[PDB]
Design a protein around this ligand. Sequence first.
Ligand SMILES: *[C@@H]1O[C@H](CO)[C@@H](O)[C@H](O)[C@H]1NC(C)=O
Lengths: 40, 48
Amino acid sequence: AAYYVGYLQPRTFLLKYNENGTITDAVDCALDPLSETKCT
Amino acid sequence: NGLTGTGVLTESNKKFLPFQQFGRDIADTTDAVRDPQTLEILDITPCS
Ligand SMILES: *[C@@H]1O[C@H](CO)[C@@H](O)[C@H](O)[C@H]1NC(C)=O
């Protein structure tokens, strides 16, 4: 066995939905400047 | 169940998740709804 621990912080996120409803892609606003371009 | 509206009601091919109960378009309208008694999926459209 093994485990992974991560922490959450306040962020804005962009979400894409599939043909039929299920989340297939995400974009994080604060990752890098290209992502800021994509979000704006 | 507290969601009140008026219009034409038909069936739909969408399949809500068990926790999913309503659907919202960009106009924040109610597009589709799951019936409490038959758990089916229904499409809503306006008339005027
Ligand atoms: C829509 O649902 C079908 C199975 O019911 C699935 O095969 C399909 O992947 C979904 N549409 C897309 C674009 O993935």
